[PDB]
Design a protein around this ligand. Structure first.
Ligand SMILES: Nc1nc2c(ncn2[C@@H]2O[C@H](COP(=O)(O)OP(=O)(O)OP(=O)(O)O)[C@@H](O)[C@H]2O)c(=O)[nH]1
Ligand SMILES: Nc1nc2c(ncn2[C@@H]2O[C@H](COP(=O)(O)OP(=O)(O)O)[C@@H](O)[C@H]2O)c(=O)[nH]1
Ligand SMILES: Nc1ncnc2c1ncn2[C@@H]1O[C@H](COP(=O)(O)OP(=O)(O)O)[C@@H](O)[C@H]1O
Ligand SMILES: [Ca+2]
Ligand SMILES: [Ca+2]
Ligand SMILES: [Ca+2]
Ligand SMILES: [Cl-]
Ligand SMILES: [Mg+2]
Ligand SMILES: [Mg+2]
Ligand SMILES: [Mg+2]
Ligand SMILES: [Mg+2]
Lengths: 422, 442, 54, 344
């Protein structure tokens, strides 16, 4: 359990993926040319989880960049850290996917997927002991969503005993590109329910609200949304990236977080929310606050099956333990009683850039059903009139596949509701 | 002299082992490079310390120890630290990926792949013994390797060394330092499969140790290092009789004989005093009466429980330091008129007492103050079953919903193994109850 | 309260004080259990690859 | 906010205590199987004491003392008294008692029975378990056969007037987590409304003073006081008017002595002073008084009720001294603190 292979697919996937690499490269002291210039050994101890070491003490992200059009990856390559990525790990077509899951999954994506897998295989081949994969993508478009889930299936077939983890951006009318997003997201969710072990549900609804309501951003851009995402992604991978006891690899995280295989969709949260001194008590209260959650679900509307909390910075561990106990002891009703001691806490001395201390929240809450119900309602409003379906049937799909995807997502909802009441 | 082989399994087992051998070296005057000046017989011998150490012609004293972990980072630290010279490479065994806090993964999936190797490396140690007594096995209940690989090892050890005794030092799970929600599952699975293979097991609840460190060492937030230094003192107190001249608990068999009349009920409670902070500027040294009295306080036990509401089958007192029998007997007489000490009808109310004149050794720069006298009581009391009750309840809460079970089945373990293990624990709780217990708006 | 079996040596002493008197699976089987579990992992994996082939 | 769980729904006292804790607004009740509680109001039987005091971040308290059953079980109390030096077989405030199985104290019982029978001494005993009054041993033994205790029956009770009637005194005693012993200032007399008849132990309505019994078999139930309960102000006035003495002097001194003796005897066995969780418990001590104004202990109850008109006050006293002592909220104590330190 050491190496992770990172993949980022499509426009959203690549934009947030690029930001993730910028952020953690800074945290690990790796500059845009892959040279190390940090002042702490904590930085390099587990650097091999995410980076290969090339010649000249150069560190290279174990990262594969995928798209069905070149535009966003041209931008990535021009980006500040664009030169750090391995040039042969850019795999792209020219056709685009037109926000169409069928094109990403069955036609345009089909034609490209083998070459992605050649690169993945070359990455896995140099791994001393691959843990598994993390994928960044959105569910509302065509490439990240349709081709991204195609990839996950092929990867599982080839590495069926490795962990699959995703950061999956869920669409919202509030931050929407096309009307077919609910279709692409429902089709993708069924894939995720079956073929990932752990999925961070990143809700563009939540991201927008935080930017608007909390950060006082009148007109949030995708860039502002991605600030929150990259901050969250750094937080939730801290335990994989730095020496530590708890959830230090992807399988142990799954074992701590997933009591039933399908219910592996996590609501992440972060504090303090950023666009000059925070106390452990304040971090703890803010990390559990709905307003700090990146999935637009009311956690008081459900129950926590499991929780992982990660605190970063120099702070009193005694105080951390006290505050974490205080949260559970004073709101014990929201933690299912049939999983004793279901909240685990890690502390890492290195804080993220620009903060003295911070906290990241990963919840497996039954309230996540609210996010799937929302997608399900939007899907049905259209599907009942078969609206916009020609875009999909034109790529060889039939309606039955929509009925099935819908049924399985409603099953998922019913399954959360079951443990909410147990 | 008859040799004992120590086996350290998984992170808790390995790190506790590290602490113990450090302490053993200090106690016997063995240097980090393995040399032992005071040992005038170069290159061999059958002194009492040779029970735990072999010797090279170069005069190096080598722990009769094997370290096993399914991932390398913890053992790599043994290979690279102070006592790296102490151990031969073949004594330190690592895999590449761990058991992921999953008993089934440690026991079936990864266990199957490394057990023949581990056994070969133990065989090598055994072939150096002229009269192997048996095994001391250190591991956690909660980890995947600690739980799952140990049970597999213990099964096979009974097959390949059928006449040898096996003692355990086992770390019982405590949420304040634990790293997995499923630790109750792993504890119960490993206890079930190990029960028939272990002759005597000393359980240490991390909660008890944690609180002793907070309360008596004024450590605000104890680390595994704090905890392991204290555990190693207790382990040393327990094994001192195998490593020094004496006439009590002089061989592994005597542990069962003195502490375990009923084979299944083989978990003695350890109680230790005194634990004093090295930072404590002014400390009044405690008497024999005071440290003995402290053996009957729950706050000093390795497992929090209430021996007053239980019964004893046996009690041993192990002293280190300035202690003579007269004061022990005076202490006991007095304690007997105050404490509730009820033995079962079929055992004599008495104490086996061992005294080693050398006071406890403490690690330079450690948390523990040097004291003039210390004691470790080992009592086989039914009250320790409180800890099984706690575990079994947690197990029941999760298992009723099959929470996390799919992880174990996915490793090829059958679900039936959960309920079989649980049934055995139920039978075990019942056994303690029978041994230990007699028989509205008003 | 009687003391008994007092033994003394340079390094220490031991004795007993009474306050009152009274009132396995073979290697074969182990291997078969591990192989049974391995077969089960194999079957579950084959089922998976079949489902992915479809 | 403090938290508590309720595990005996049939308890009137703690139902009232629960009612009160809520009404403060600083206590919240959890589901009975939620482990994150400060306070357990526990079940009467097989309370899981082993699962208490293992919740990081919570000081935990329970309303029963593990081991107090030794005092609160007929057979146990007899054994405890005979075998404890501080009480002893020679103890003077507990009637001669023997434990009889259907070890068994049979031959020892008969020996004292015969002894009385030969000395002409009055020889009525009472058998009961967790009731037969008789002067014939054979009957006593034969009834049981069909664990018990046989107890010298107090042939010479103090009889109230008018009524020529028997009674027993209930005292409520709260022992807190520090092992302070608090005697509630209000006790109650459970009276028999039927004149005492010593030439017929067959009809037991005039011989056994239990509320339930007088509430059925007694055709004068409620005749002298409501219901069959005389309280202390009145009983004291009676003692002053009739016997020229006070309740304090003739009776209560012995009661306090007995209560303290019993509880101090078992303190080493049940104290939670250095324990990872803490206990308190409310006890119901039952007394009889003879015509010499001598007090005898009959039994100790581990899960008592309270007299209707006293719940409010006693139950408030419970949260005051037993609960808020451990978990303080954001007089003229109703209790008498039983303490005494004679030097010798
Ligand atoms: N006292 C003490 N307990 C420890 C130590 N290390 C881990 N533990 C406890 O052991 C349990 C976790 O088991 P580990 O030994 O770390 O796991 P492992 O045996 O290495 O097994 P895997 O990592 O799952 O393969 C938890 O209850 C920990 O709190 C240690 O050094 N000292
Ligand atoms: N948070 C975030 N969401 C994005 C970004 N780009 C696109 N999206 C969302 O992703 C969905 C559109 O899919 P996209 O990734 O652009 O299509 P693809 O290239 O075919 O995968 C919509 O839900 C958009 O709101 C981005 O940079 N950040
Ligand atoms: N030794 C005795 N002498 C006289 N009366 C007794 C004696 N023992 C019991 N009684 C009567 O029987 C009643 C019930 O007995 P007791 O054991 O105190 O309560 P319970 O049977 O309700 O547990 C008492 O209130 C008392 O009136
Ligand atoms: Ca083409
Ligand atoms: Ca030698
Ligand atoms: Ca055996
Ligand atoms: Cl053998
Ligand atoms: Mg787009
Ligand atoms: Mg490990
Ligand atoms: Mg009564
Ligand atoms: Mg009664």
């Amino acid at each position: 359990m050491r190496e992770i292979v990172h993949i980022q697919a499509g426009q959203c996937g690549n934009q947030i993926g690029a930001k993730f690499w910028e952020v953690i490269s800074d945290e690990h002291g790796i500059d845009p040319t892959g040279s190390y210039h940090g002042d702490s050994d904590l930085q390099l101890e587990r650097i091999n989880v995410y980076y290969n070491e090339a010649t000249g003490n150069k560190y290279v992200p174990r990262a594969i960049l995928v798209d069905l059009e070149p535009g966003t990856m041209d931008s990535v390559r021009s980006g500040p850290f664009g030169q750090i990525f391995r040039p042969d790990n850019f795999v792209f077509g020219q056709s685009g996917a037109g926000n169409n899951w069928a094109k990403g999954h069955y036609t345009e994506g089909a034609e490209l997927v083998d070459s992605v897998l050649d690169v993945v295989r070359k990455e896995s081949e140099s791994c001393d002991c691959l843990q598994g994969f993390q994928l960044t993508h959105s569910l509302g478009g065509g490439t990240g969503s349709g081709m991204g889930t195609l990839l996950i299936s092929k990867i599982r077939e080839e590495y069926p005993d490795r962990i699959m983890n995703t950061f999956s951006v869920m669409p919202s009318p509030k931050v929407s590109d096309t009307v077919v997003e609910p279709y692409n997201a429902t089709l993708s969710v069924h894939q995720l329910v079956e073929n990932t072990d752990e999925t961070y549900c990143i809700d563009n609804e939540a991201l927008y609200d935080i930017c608007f309501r909390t950060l006082k951003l009148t007109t949030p851009t995708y860039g502002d949304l991605n600030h929150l995402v990259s901050a969250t992604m750094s937080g939730v991978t801290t335990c994989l990236r730095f020496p530590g006891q708890l959830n230090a690899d992807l399988r142990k995280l799954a074992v701590n977080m997933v009591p039933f295989p399908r219910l592996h969709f996590f609501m992440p949260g972060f504090a303090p929310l950023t666009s000059r001194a925070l106390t452990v008590p304040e971090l703890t209260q803010q990390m559990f606050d709905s307003k700090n959650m990146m999935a637009a679900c009311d956690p008081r509307h459900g129950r926590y099956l499991t929780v992982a909390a990660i605190f970063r910075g120099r702070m009193s561990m005694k105080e951390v333990d006290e505050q974490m106990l205080n949260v559970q002891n004073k709101n014990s009703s929201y933690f299912v009683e049939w999983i004793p001691n279901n909240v685990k806490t890690a502390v890492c001395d290195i804080p993220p850039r620009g903060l003295k201390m911070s906290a990241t929240f990963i919840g497996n809450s039954t309230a996540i059903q609210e996010l799937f119900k929302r997608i399900s309602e939007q899907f049905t409003a259209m599907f009942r009139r078969k609206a916009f379906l020609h875009w999909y049937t034109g790529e060889g799909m039939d309606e039955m596949e929509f009925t099935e995807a819908e049924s399985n997502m409603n099953d998922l909802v019913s399954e959360y509701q079951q443990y909410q009441d147990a | 002299m008859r040799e004992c082989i120590s086996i350290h399994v998984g992170q808790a087992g390995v790190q506790i082992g590290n602490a113990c051998w450090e302490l053993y070296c200090l106690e016997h005057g063995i240097q980090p490079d393995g040399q032992m000046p005071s040992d005038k017989t170069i290159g061999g011998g059958d002194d009492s310390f040779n029970t735990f150490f072999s010797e090279t012609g170069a005069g190096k004293h080598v722990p009769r120890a094997v370290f096993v972990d399914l991932e390398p980072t913890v053992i790599d630290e043994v290979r690279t630290g102070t006592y790296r010279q102490l151990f031969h490479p073949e004594q330190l065994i690592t895999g590449k990926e761990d058991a992921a806090n999953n008993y089934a993964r440690g026991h079936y999936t990864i266990g199957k792949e490394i057990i023949d190797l581990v056994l070969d490396r133990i065989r090598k140690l055994a072939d150096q013994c002229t009269g192997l007594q048996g095994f001391l096995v250190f591991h956690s209940f909660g980890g995947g390797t600690g739980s799952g690989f140990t049970s597999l090892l213990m099964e096979r050890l009974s097959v390949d060394y059928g006449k040898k005794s096996k003692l355990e030092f086992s770390i019982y799970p405590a949420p304040q330092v634990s790293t997995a929600v499923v630790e109750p599952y792993n504890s119960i699975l490993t206890t079930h499969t190990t029960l028939e293979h272990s002759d005597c097991a000393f359980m240490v609840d991390n909660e008890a140790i944690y609180d002793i460190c907070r309360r008596n060492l004024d450590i605000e937030r104890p680390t595994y290092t704090n905890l392991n230094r204290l555990i190693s003192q207790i382990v040393s107190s327990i094994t001192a009789s195998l490593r020094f001249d004496g006439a009590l608990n002089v061989d592994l068999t005597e542990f069962q004989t003195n502490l375990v009349p009923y084979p299944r009920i083989h978990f003695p409670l350890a109680t230790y005093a005194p634990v004093i902070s090295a930072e404590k500027a002014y400390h009044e040294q405690l008497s024999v009466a005071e440290i003995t009295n402290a053996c009957f306080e729950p706050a000093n036990q390795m497992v929090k429980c209430d021996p007053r509401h239980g019964k004893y089958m046996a009690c041993c007192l192990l002293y280190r330091g300035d202690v003579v029998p007269k004061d022990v007997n005076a202490a006991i007489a007095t304690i007997k008129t105050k404490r509730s000490i009820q033995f079962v009808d079929w055992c004599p109310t008495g104490f086996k007492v061992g005294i080693n004149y050398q006071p406890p050794t403490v690690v330079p720069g450690g948390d523990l103050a040097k004291v003039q006298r210390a004691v470790c009581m080992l009592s086989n009391t039914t009250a320790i079953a409180e800890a099984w009750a706690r575990l079994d309840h947690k197990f029941d809460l999760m298992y009723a919903k099959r929470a996390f079970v799919h992880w174990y089945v996915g490793e090829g373990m059958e679900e039936g193994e959960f309920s079989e293990a649980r049934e055995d624990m139920a039978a075990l709780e019942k056994d303690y109850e029978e041994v230990g217990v007699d028989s509205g708006e008003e | 309260m009687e003391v008994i079996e007092l033994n003394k040596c340079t390094s220490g002493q031991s004795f007993e004080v009474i306050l009152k008197p009274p009132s396995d699976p073979s290697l074969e089987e182990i291997q078969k259990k591990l192989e049974a579990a391995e077969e089960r992992r194999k079957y579950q994996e084959a089922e998976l690859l079949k489902h992915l082939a479809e | 906010m403090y938290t508590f769980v309720v595990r005996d729904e049939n308890s009137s006292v703690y139902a009232e205590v629960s009612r009160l804790l809520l009404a403060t607004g600083q206590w919240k009740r959890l589901r009975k199987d939620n482990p994150r509680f400060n306070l357990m109001l526990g079940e009467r039987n097989r309370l899981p004491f082993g699962r208490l005091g293992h919740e990081p971040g919570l000081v935990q308290l329970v309303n029963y003392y593990r081991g107090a059953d030794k005092l609160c079980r007929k057979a146990s109390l007899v054994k405890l008294i005979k075998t404890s030096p501080e009480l002893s077989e020679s103890c003077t405030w507990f009637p001669e008692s023997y434990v009889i199985y259907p070890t068994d104290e049979r031959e020892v019982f008969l020996a004292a029975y015969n002894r009385r029978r030969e000395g002409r001494e009055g020889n009525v005993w009472i058998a009961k378990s967790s009731i037969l009054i008789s002067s014939e041993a054979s009957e006593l033994l034969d009834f049981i056969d069909e664990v018990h205790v046989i107890q010298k029956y107090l042939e010479k009770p103090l009889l109230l007037e008018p009524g020529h009637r028997k009674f027993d005194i209930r005292s409520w005693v709260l022992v807190d987590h520090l092992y302070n012993i608090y005697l509630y200032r209000e006790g109650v007399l459970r009276t028999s409304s039927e004149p005492y008849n010593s030439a017929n132990f067959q009809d037991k309505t005039c011989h056994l003073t239990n509320h339930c019994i007088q509430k059925e078999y007694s055709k004068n139930y409620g005749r002298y006081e409501e219901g069959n309960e005389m309280f202390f102000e009145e009983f004291n006035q009676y003692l002053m008017d009739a016997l020229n003495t006070t309740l304090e002097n003739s009776i209560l001194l012995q009661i306090k002595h007995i209560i303290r003796s019993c509880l101090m005897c078992i303190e080493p066995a049940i104290s939670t002073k250095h324990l990872h969780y803490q206990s308190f418990q409310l006890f119901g001590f039952d007394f009889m008084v003879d015509e010499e104004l001598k007090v005898w202990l009959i039994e100790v109850n581990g899960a008592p009720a309270c007299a209707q008109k006293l719940y409010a006050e006693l139950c408030q006293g419970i949260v005051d001294v037993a609960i808020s002592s451990v978990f303080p909220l954001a007089p003229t104590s109703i209790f008498i603190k039983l303490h005494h330190h004679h030097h010798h």
